[PDB]
């Protein structure tokens with residue numbers, strides 16, 4: 261296949277500042293901060309994923325695998341890797357998404373989210389996924405928790421810790437046994453651990469169902485072991501109250517057991533774009549329709565602030 265000529269930039273620890281902790285887990289802490297590359301009069305808002313311990317060999321391999329696939333994508337609707345820092349504890353430096361996950365955002369503003377935003381988000385995520393399909397990359401963990409909000413008008417796919425690049429001439433990826441989110445997975449992934457771009461389309465439909473229900477948990481109260489028999493019986497997630505049948509039909513088509521009968525991300529872009537032209541016809545919602553970076557980054561001087569989307573090499 262085509263050679264992968266993505267650049268991997270190694271960053272000095274002294275040219276980025278950590279401002280605050282966005283979140284923490286066993287994997288490690290995600291900081292929010294500024295990256296000031298020397299010689300350039302720019303300041304990039306960044307999220308900095310530090311690894312908890314320096315000594316874990318499996319965790320260090322996994323964070324570099326994440327950097328490999330993240331550096332291999334360059335799309336407006338995919339979160340971009342700025343670089344890595346090879347300190348005692350490895351650090352990923354990513355474009356800052358100020359508003360957090362789309363899942364947390366819709367739960368936070370159920371009352372203030374209109375159909376224009378929901379349909380635009382669906383378009384943007386389909387565009388990101390279709391770009392990932394052109395790159396022959398399977399995400400394997402598409403969910404509302406892994407879509408971040410740069411602005412309310414602009415969302416990006418992230419969390420490539422499970423993503424796999426398809427080798428030359430292959431269209432399926434066979435995975436070894438591991439922790440995996442069953443309620444977002446195509447049937448063929450649950451049973452045979454096969455993953456394709458059409459398996460991601462299944463996860464796309466669940467993601468859209470998450471958005472359309474304003475943050476509800478799919479199959480709440482149902483064990484993941486039973487999910488396989490439920491799917492084989494022909495049951496699916498129910499129509500969200502705001503959804504016209506036009507929208508719900510697209511979600512249902514994403515959950516066909518025959519993977520080739522599901523839509524392609526190319527077609528999802530087209531269909532949700534049509535609906536984004538007249539949003540209130542396809543979603544029925546009650547009551548429908550410079551200094552910010554200083555406050556965010558807590559730094560008085562923001563004259564040279566530049567979003568990574570305007571920073572290229």
Ligand SMILES: CCC(=O)Nc1cccc(-c2c(-c3ccc(N4CCN(C)CC4)cc3)[nH]c3ncnc(OCC(C)C)c23)c1
Nearest residue numbers: 282283290307309354355356357358359360361405418419
């Ligand atoms: C994967 C789920 C998740 O929440 N991940 C996460 C954890 C901590 C920070 C961020 C994050 C955030 C972020 C997450 C949460 C918030 N808050 C804002 C305040 N609000 C009350 C709650 C949500 C603000 C920013 N922005 C990012 N940008 C680029 N990469 C990131 O990390 C990406 C992961 C893949 C390294 C992140 C995301």
